[PDB]
Amino acid sequence: ALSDNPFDAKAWRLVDGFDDLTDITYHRHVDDATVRVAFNRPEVRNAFRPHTVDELYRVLDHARMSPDVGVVLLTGNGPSPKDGGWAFCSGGDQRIRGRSGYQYASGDTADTVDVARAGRLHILEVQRLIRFMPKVVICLVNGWAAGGGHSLHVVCDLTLASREYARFKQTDADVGSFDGGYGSAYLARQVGQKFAREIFFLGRTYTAEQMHQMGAVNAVAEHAELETVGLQWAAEINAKSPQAQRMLKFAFNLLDDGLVGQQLFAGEATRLAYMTDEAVEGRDAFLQKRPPDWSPFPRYF
Amino acid sequence: ALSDNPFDAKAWRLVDGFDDLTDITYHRHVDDATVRVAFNRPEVRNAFRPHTVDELYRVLDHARMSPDVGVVLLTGNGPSPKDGGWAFCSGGDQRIRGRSGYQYASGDTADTVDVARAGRLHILEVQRLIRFMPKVVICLVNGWAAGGGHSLHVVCDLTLASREYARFKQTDADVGSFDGGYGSAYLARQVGQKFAREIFFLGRTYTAEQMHQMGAVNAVAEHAELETVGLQWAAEINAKSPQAQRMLKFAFNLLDDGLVGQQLFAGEATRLAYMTDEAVEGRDAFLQKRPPDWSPFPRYF
Amino acid sequence: DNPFDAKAWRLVDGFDDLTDITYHRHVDDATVRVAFNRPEVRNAFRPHTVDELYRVLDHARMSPDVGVVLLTGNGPSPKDGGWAFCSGGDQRIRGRSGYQYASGDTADTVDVARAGRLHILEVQRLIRFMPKVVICLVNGWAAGGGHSLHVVCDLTLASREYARFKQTDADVGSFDGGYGSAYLARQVGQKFAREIFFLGRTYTAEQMHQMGAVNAVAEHAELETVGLQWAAEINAKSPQAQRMLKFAFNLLDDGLVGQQLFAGEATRLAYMTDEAVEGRDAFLQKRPPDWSPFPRYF
Amino acid sequence: NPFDAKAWRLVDGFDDLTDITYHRHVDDATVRVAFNRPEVRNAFRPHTVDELYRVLDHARMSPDVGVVLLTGNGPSPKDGGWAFCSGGDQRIRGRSGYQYASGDTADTVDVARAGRLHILEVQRLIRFMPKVVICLVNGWAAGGGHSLHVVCDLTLASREYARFKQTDADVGSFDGGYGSAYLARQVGQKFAREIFFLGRTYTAEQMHQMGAVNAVAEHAELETVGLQWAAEINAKSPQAQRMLKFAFNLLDDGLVGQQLFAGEATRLAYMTDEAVEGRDAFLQKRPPDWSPFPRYF
Amino acid sequence: ALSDNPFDAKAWRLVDGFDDLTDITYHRHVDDATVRVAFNRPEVRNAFRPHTVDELYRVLDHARMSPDVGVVLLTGNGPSPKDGGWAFCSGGDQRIRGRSGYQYASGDTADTVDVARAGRLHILEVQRLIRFMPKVVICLVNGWAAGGGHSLHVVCDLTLASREYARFKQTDADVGSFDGGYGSAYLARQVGQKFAREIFFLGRTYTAEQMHQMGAVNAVAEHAELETVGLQWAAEINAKSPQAQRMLKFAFNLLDDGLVGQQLFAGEATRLAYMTDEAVEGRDAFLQKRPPDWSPFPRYF
Amino acid sequence: DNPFDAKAWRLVDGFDDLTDITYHRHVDDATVRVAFNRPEVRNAFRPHTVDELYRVLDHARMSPDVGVVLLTGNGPSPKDGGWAFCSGGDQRIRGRSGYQYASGDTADTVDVARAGRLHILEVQRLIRFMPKVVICLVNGWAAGGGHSLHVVCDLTLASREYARFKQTDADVGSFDGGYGSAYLARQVGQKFAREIFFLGRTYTAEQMHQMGAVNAVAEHAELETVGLQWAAEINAKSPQAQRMLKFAFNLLDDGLVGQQLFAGEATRLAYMTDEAVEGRDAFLQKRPPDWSPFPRYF
Ligand SMILES: CC(C)(COP(=O)(O)OP(=O)(O)OC[C@H]1O[C@@H](n2cnc3c(N)ncnc32)[C@H](O)[C@@H]1OP(=O)(O)O)[C@@H](O)C(=O)NCCC(=O)NCCSC(=O)c1ccc2ccccc2c1O
Ligand SMILES: CC(C)(COP(=O)(O)OP(=O)(O)OC[C@H]1O[C@@H](n2cnc3c(N)ncnc32)[C@H](O)[C@@H]1OP(=O)(O)O)[C@@H](O)C(=O)NCCC(=O)NCCSC(=O)c1ccc2ccccc2c1O
Ligand SMILES: CC(C)(COP(=O)(O)OP(=O)(O)OC[C@H]1O[C@@H](n2cnc3c(N)ncnc32)[C@H](O)[C@@H]1OP(=O)(O)O)[C@@H](O)C(=O)NCCC(=O)NCCSC(=O)c1ccc2ccccc2c1O
Numbered sequence A, B, E: 001a002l003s004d005n006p007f008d009a010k011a012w013r014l015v016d017g018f019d020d021l022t023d024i025t026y027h028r029h030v031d032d033a034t035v036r037v038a039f040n041r042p043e044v045r046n047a048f049r050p051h052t053v054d055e056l057y058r059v060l061d062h063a064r065m066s067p068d069v070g071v072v073l074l075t076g077n078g079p080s081p082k083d084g085g086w087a088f089c090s091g092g093d094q095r096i097r098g099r100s101g102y103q104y105a106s107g108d109t110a111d112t113v114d115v116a117r118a119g120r121l122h123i124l125e126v127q128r129l130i131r132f133m134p135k136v137v138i139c140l141v142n143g144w145a146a147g148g149g150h151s152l153h154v155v156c157d158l159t160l161a162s163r164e165y166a167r168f169k170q171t172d173a174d175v176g177s178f179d180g181g182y183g184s185a186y187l188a189r190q191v192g193q194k195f196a197r198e199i200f201f202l203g204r205t206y207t208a209e210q211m212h213q214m215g216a217v218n219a220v221a222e223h224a225e226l227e228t229v230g231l232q233w234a235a236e237i238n239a240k241s242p243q244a245q246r247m248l249k250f251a252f253n254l255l256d257d258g259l260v261g262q263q264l265f266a267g268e269a270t271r272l273a274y275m276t277d278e279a280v281e282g283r284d285a286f287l288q289k290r291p292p293d294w295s296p297f298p299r300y301f
Numbered sequence C, F: 001d002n003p004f005d006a007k008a009w010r011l012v013d014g015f016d017d018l019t020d021i022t023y024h025r026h027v028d029d030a031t032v033r034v035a036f037n038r039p040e041v042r043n044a045f046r047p048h049t050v051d052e053l054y055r056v057l058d059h060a061r062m063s064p065d066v067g068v069v070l071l072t073g074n075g076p077s078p079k080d081g082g083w084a085f086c087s088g089g090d091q092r093i094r095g096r097s098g099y100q101y102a103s104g105d106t107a108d109t110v111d112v113a114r115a116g117r118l119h120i121l122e123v124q125r126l127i128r129f130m131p132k133v134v135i136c137l138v139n140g141w142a143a144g145g146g147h148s149l150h151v152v153c154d155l156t157l158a159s160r161e162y163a164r165f166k167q168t169d170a171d172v173g174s175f176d177g178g179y180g181s182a183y184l185a186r187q188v189g190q191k192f193a194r195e196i197f198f199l200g201r202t203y204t205a206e207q208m209h210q211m212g213a214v215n216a217v218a219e220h221a222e223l224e225t226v227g228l229q230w231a232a233e234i235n236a237k238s239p240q241a242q243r244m245l246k247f248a249f250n251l252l253d254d255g256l257v258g259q260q261l262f263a264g265e266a267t268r269l270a271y272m273t274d275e276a277v278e279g280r281d282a283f284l285q286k287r288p289p290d291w292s293p294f295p296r297y298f
Numbered sequence D: 001n002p003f004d005a006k007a008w009r010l011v012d013g014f015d016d017l018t019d020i021t022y023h024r025h026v027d028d029a030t031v032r033v034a035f036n037r038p039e040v041r042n043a044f045r046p047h048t049v050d051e052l053y054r055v056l057d058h059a060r061m062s063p064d065v066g067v068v069l070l071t072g073n074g075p076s077p078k079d080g081g082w083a084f085c086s087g088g089d090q091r092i093r094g095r096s097g098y099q100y101a102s103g104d105t106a107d108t109v110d111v112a113r114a115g116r117l118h119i120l121e122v123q124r125l126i127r128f129m130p131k132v133v134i135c136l137v138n139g140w141a142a143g144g145g146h147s148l149h150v151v152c153d154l155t156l157a158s159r160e161y162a163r164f165k166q167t168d169a170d171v172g173s174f175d176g177g178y179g180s181a182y183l184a185r186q187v188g189q190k191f192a193r194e195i196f197f198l199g200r201t202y203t204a205e206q207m208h209q210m211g212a213v214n215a216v217a218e219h220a221e222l223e224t225v226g227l228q229w230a231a232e233i234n235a236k237s238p239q240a241q242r243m244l245k246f247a248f249n250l251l252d253d254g255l256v257g258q259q260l261f262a263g264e265a266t267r268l269a270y271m272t273d274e275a276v277e278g279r280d281a282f283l284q285k286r287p288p289d290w291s292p293f294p295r296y297f
């Protein structure tokens, strides 16, 4: 009766238009305003290749533009059919990593790499998409989270982790790589500079409880219940003012993201201003080629 | 023998000139350089209305300008005479909240709102007064700390919380509101970005011990001893160089507050320069209409 | 000639007791005039001056029928005909602990029991944080703390003939290590700002305009007339938008304080929506809120 | 007319564009992207924004393109007026933002569909793309149109017809992001506040004096000079140009800025033998040998 | 058998050229790419005087420039021969502190102070050296860490602390001093603003375990094993890509250090660019006085 | 015509061994002159040049009788009469690991066992952090890293006739991604700074002055004479105030490092007080401190 798999097929439906997905799965909950986005290459611990990043971007972007979706659950499928091992995401697929970055290939191995096509590092675009979308993204760490996979959990708004199977391991420097952006600096804004430097410089494996104690993981859950708890967290988020939740996310981003953070938060303020009679008077005055009349609108202080 | 009330009336005296306070109480300790500032509307869990904010500002401002006061203890009176419930502060009084913010009213309910008078959100001014005053402000959370009340706690330099009665709950998004300034972004600089986002996005109730573990509460105390512990903390603060304590507070504020932070710290540096013979030579040379002589004052490196 | 046109201005009720500052409301416009009134010492401010200045600016901030503040200096000097906006802190009553309250004009009347203050910094923040445009009209010398006040204002207009900018801080052993210096660098760039402070030279209106700290140069007699024209153009726009724009300009430079002020106004904007009103109503009626009428935007 | 048709070719796959034009230079690694609604001073509606994003994104991913020229077509067939871009099309502005419509006017708005403000997405795309974007202001630049020039890396402006006018507060709108705060990092806080608070009209020469316009050119020569600038840019080390742009963005853009600059530093490390040894060791399931690679200081 | 001393004399060799050191010791490990740098005035709890600072800077600078050294262990020798008391570092030597700062003296006490020579506060230069050097610096807190000694610990990349003997006490304000830089503001980026303010404003003594719980100490070790654990941590660090480790340290520093942070990280990016064929084409074209040919080098995105 | 007036300058004791740099102290003023001395390669620096430049600037930093550093280039070139401030890194000894030490002048003599360095960045930080005003006198070409050196100096004066600013970094596949670029933008604004780097055009003294990166333009023969005048005006003010001001200008731009330096100086001011001394004395006398004589200021 105890399931080894967090996924409950009865609770989830495929999303229309996404039959061609190979490296990623995308479900919408049967009742809730919540979607499930998951890595789908468990044979390589859910390592992503450039095509994986493209699918992940497409799917997250679709969720961003779905008005009836409030929360994204980001996770990994499994286990490995080869050894039963569990993974959230093991970062960039090393098999198709070249001197210019991760390269598109016709097959799974290095020999099928299109040598004419320069490599990319555009998981960074997925990071920004997660960061900038006006919806809460909750990472469900159901297994190994290593390299770029570790950095993905870091950039999510919230993280829940499997007690039995979550393993956090920043392996970047082991393979001569490094996430010098959100993966490292933003980790320091969750667990502090000392712990963050330890995690990267020594590359040790941490449990869910250890990461929770340090401040990068919000709560620990039983593996079988990880998505159930995820859905409960999403339900609590979706039960509040969506307008307030949106502003709050951009408020938490703002200063850390400089002018970009201000752009997003100020953008939402501009939308709020557009709803007002005062802004409509401004529009109407222009269209009617007359001076605007601001006298009904007080100078708040 | 066990008091349900943290307040020890024998230890405190009313402050002269504060006759007319209705929403707030203001005491000076009988021996120590410490004052007690408290919300005084326990029947509504110490929610503040614009008049409450005005009294609070005036009282904190007086404490700021009192040379014989080193530490402010900010707390809530209680319990509710209606149900015996304890509160530090439950944020803005929802009864007089309008479309333009919290509105002045002649009575307690929405019907007595002065409709000719625009709403205000100027608890933010109290936040800055606490932030900018050259004295340590310790928040003693003696009960519910919710909404704007939670955010007041966040902005204080230090927080002590009642074991039995403190309950931290960020209810902003529940009533369609949000503190997008110190309430949220500054919380993240105490407990890290993941926990701060959790606290706001889910709006769960946290105990003193839980908040202490996350990093927003300095210590947990027995309810009956909360002000006693507060006074002990104040005494330790007051036993150090007042000049060093002043500079240290502005040093902690500085970068987080940008140019405002620099302004406050540099302002105190200017005062230190004014104490020197070199600065006195500059003033005198101008007043005597002669060139200054800097030769007695060596260059340091 | 004199930039002050007495016919255009009325005294503000409740301010009969002002000694170091004058305060007028325009006869027709949503504009006030705030001016230093010690031209015999080049409009140097003492602590009492600062108190009056703060109180008057605070009153303008809280006047809903006022949109723009014009900050300037009265003159000329009755002693030598010299023109000044403001020459900074009154050096006569500067002590080792800062500028001190005194019953008279000189150090001999200083209240020795009372520590000195530097709370022009409080006026700077009041100017910086108020949800209204403050225009500095530099009608003469602007030196020391007076120079730093023009720097922190949103806009500066300057008298062609008589405006003189001179950062004399380091000459008398002082320094504005806040807005006076760092924020000046965000107007004229780090090289020019360092020059202005390190060498303490005198600059004309036109020179400051070329460097970027002065918005426009006006004829002396027309300085307040041009100020009123600028104020009128500002007052012809959405007050809501002007308010948001000022705080947007402040935001990143002011860190968490900047975010607090801008987000504070964003919160007011949310409070105006039906969605926020449903949040209030549900709490008051002790029922669950119903968010279904309010769509998610992206 | 600044447009020289002989110098430009249409780009394959963009036959369906209606609000925007998109050309590639016949010889140079340079593209031309232009607003194409001159009858309303090149105001953009959400469809314009979608086309603009799609086109700039394509330019970003085109390895044989080094520089983007962003401008407006004209003149107005109605009054001969010249415009770069007048910002959001006010006719279809609603309480929820700019709304999709089947026609040009408010009565054709799809009421079932919420409005958007996603010109901000185009701003970020210009900002984050590893190529220089030069704005050619050939006419009116107002509202969101003014803000689009602000966010471009460089701006060249028509002496006779460029008109800069930040009208945001006139119509109760505001760009509280790059449009204003970033303008201040070009012309300084005093001038930026003046531009927004008063919303006056400025010439090319005035904006050049303030620091927001790199150079003024004769109207007929505006695109010719743009192409000359693009050529000088394309003649340098592309790797260095790329690093330079993100270095300029970095601190102003906080963690996002660091992410972009560090992303390119990561690529540079991937080129090294040391990084390749890291990949090889993992793939071959053996310990890495770092001894051939010395520590630098 | 149980050693009271963390130092294992068999594991360390003196470094050539440092025979003249008096206030500091400097060893290189017999096998590992690791050095040991230690305060050597245990009779005054390893308080530093200006000569100590000069030696410390010299030794750390030499380590910075040693290509075969990857990690610096920074600690204190002991115990005091007077009372057996243990110290990492008790900050500035108060005996030779004057009105212009810490002063050079021929002897140990104030009467041998060179009055003609202005005082200095240049432990700040050692702080920046630790901060900016492209190698991990691990602080081994083997006893008291107080005042400026506490701040040195704060600025190191990692801290390990002796269970039995580590005592953290920020005493600055007790003696009228303050570290308004890394000592305070950077501490806040490790333990959060509330705990950081508490540490300074109250100046209480904290254990290794307490500082670890707050986030300023990475791990607690047995006193006899402190340097053994230090060596184990260094070995894990030294087993990764040295290039990646370097980039990662400056990535963690970057935003916190503004333009200085950008300068250091960008400098390393420039070195990486110099390794490329493209950069070499740039150099060669200039030297051969011909136009560069960039056509072999793809634009990446 | 030469800007250098030999009569005004004396060699500094202990610096006889300098080869790539010259170092003089003024015969009367608290001012030194530090100059690149390889005019045959447009004053391009090699690693040895950087070491000498650091040592000389460090010595000036620690000299209590020196207030101002004038940083410039010697010339003209004995080969073609060309004038240079500094053309950046010596490309002849640039390798894949950076600029390399060599026994001779050319690439064939580089020590292959010794990795390259980019440590002109250390000189930039030394200029940036030293508590004294550094004025760059651009007497000729300023290119690459040489351009970045002027950018990081506090003030820049430039020769009308011979100053030439040209950011050639991207021409040779290099880039200054720190103070050279990002800090230039805080002088001339983001548009002009991007223009300067992306196109790498040559600009005159007058053009750079208009953009905001050059404080003043001077006649070539008078460049050091004007430099000495600027230094004299700087040296006539409170040294303590000038010091605080420089770190105040640095502060926010330099994050925790900026704060560290400014607060460090504030700590020194505090050490001068009776209050700080009571703290010391109480510790030394093993007694509680008595803070009662020292008032709380606000
Ligand atoms: C360039 C002038 C403005 C005009 O000179 P002029 O030749 O035209 O007239 P002058 O003879 O100097 O002045 C006329 C009368 O006014 C007096 N006076 C002018 N300014 C002041 C003044 N600030 N304080 C006291 N008296 C002043 C003069 O002494 C003189 O008095 P009289 O001989 O008729 O008896 C010149 O007077 C002057 O340099 N005055 C001093 C400017 C000054 O150093 N102000 C204060 C420096 S510091 C500062 O303002 C300040 C304040 C608060 C701060 C807070 C935080 C951080 C920094 C702060 C700060 O830097
Ligand atoms: C200064 C002009 C550009 C030139 O005036 P001119 O006197 O030469 O010609 P005019 O007769 O006014 O315009 C010619 C035709 O084009 C129309 N037109 C011009 N601009 C627009 C326009 N923006 N929207 C709709 N129609 C426009 C005019 O109504 C007119 O139509 P007609 O009566 O001949 O049939 C003037 O047209 C004008 O003020 N246009 C409006 C400028 C404007 O306020 N744009 C919107 C500001 S708000 C905005 O762009 C925007 C968008 C997204 C944002 C996202 C986040 C944050 C902020 C945002 C934002 O602020
Ligand atoms: C907590 C202790 C470290 C341990 O106390 P314990 O109870 O174990 O034994 P104790 O009797 O106090 O010390 C044993 C011997 O060591 C001496 N000693 C300990 N620390 C110092 C010390 N720092 N300076 C001079 N002597 C010291 C003691 O006086 C005593 O001497 P003895 O009576 O045998 O002759 C305690 O000694 C103590 O508080 N020491 C002072 C800590 C302190 O306040 N240091 C200076 C704060 S300021 C700071 O370090 C500093 C320095 C440079 C800075 C530069 C720029 C900006 C900031 C700076 C800065 O903040």
Ligand SMILES: CC(C)(COP(=O)(O)OP(=O)(O)OC[C@H]1O[C@@H](n2cnc3c(N)ncnc32)[C@H](O)[C@@H]1OP(=O)(O)O)[C@@H](O)C(=O)NCCC(=O)NCCSC(=O)c1ccc2ccccc2c1O
Pocket: E267, E270, F040, F041, F042, F044, F045, F079, F082, F087, F088, F089, F090, F091, F092, F118, F119, F120, F121, F141, F143, F144, F145, F146, F166, F168, F169, F171, F172, F174, F175, F176, F177
């Ligand atoms: C614009 C000139 C300065 C003047 O041109 P002109 O036509 O007047 O004279 P020219 O014939 O080019 O030069 C005269 C002699 O001096 C030589 N020369 C001039 N500059 C250099 C030079 N920098 N290195 C080596 N030789 C140089 C010339 O090769 C030539 O040698 P000759 O033919 O007599 O044997 C031109 O010479 C020139 O562009 N020189 C190279 C400028 C350059 O690209 N420098 C390196 C950019 S990168 C850089 O400096 C640098 C260094 C360290 C960094 C560290 C961290 C981050 C960034 C860094 C960085 O960007």
